């Protein structure tokens, strides 16, 4: 409820906020095997090669989108809401929106625009935990997510 939507904004703000400025944050988000920094490991591993995999599709929604500060986020946000709302859930459709939103916060960063990295994660995690609710619960949350892509 309140707890799913916290846990998905602490792994996806702090996953945005580490693609864009190339640092990994020095205080952990939890104890050394708790869910959230498994599932932030994971994302580090998979989220990453979706970016090099999707990059021509990535890099042309962007400038389609055309993102140059905060209203633009929120405005198209409606955009994001209509899409994902519609089809198939699954962990990969998941993993690739949340790569789509730190290939936007690495850009975010070079406009200069490093305060919208914030109300963009807000926009992603509020999307994929109201629209897909049900789905994430059944699938064990962000274990199933860990589980799903474990090496
Ligand atoms: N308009 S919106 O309500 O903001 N939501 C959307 C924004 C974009 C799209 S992309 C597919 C529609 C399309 C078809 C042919 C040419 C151009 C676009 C879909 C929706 C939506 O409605 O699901
Ligand atoms: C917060 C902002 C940055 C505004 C923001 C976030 C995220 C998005 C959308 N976000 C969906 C999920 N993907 S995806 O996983 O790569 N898979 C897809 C990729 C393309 C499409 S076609 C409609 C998207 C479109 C519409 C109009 C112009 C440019 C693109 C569908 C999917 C899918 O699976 O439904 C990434 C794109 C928009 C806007």
């Excluded at 799913?4 to 020095?26: C, F, M, P």
């Excluded at 104890?31 to 090099?52: I, P």
């Excluded at 629209?131 to 799903?148: A, H, N, P, S, Y």
Aim: net charge positive; with cysteine; charged share 30%.
């Amino acid at each position: 409820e309140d707890e799913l939507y916290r846990q998905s904004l602490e792994i996806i703000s702090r996953y945005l906020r580490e693609q864009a400025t190339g640092a990994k944050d020095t205080k952990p988000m939890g104890r050394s095997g708790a869910t959230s920094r498994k599932a932030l490991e994971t994302l580090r591993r998979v989220g990453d090669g979706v970016q090099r995999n999707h990059e021509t599709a990535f890099q042309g929604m962007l400038r389609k989108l055309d993102i140059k500060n905060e209203d633009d986020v929120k405005s198209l946000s409606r955009v994001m809401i209509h899409v994902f709302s519609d089809g198939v859930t699954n962990w990969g459709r998941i993993v690739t929106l949340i790569s789509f939103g730190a290939f936007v916060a690495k850009h975010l960063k070079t406009i200069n625009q490093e305060s919208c990295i914030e109300p963009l994660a807000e926009s992603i995690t509020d999307v994929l935990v109201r629209t897909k609710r049900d789905w994430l619960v059944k699938q064990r949350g962000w274990d199933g997510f860990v589980e799903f892509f474990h090496v």
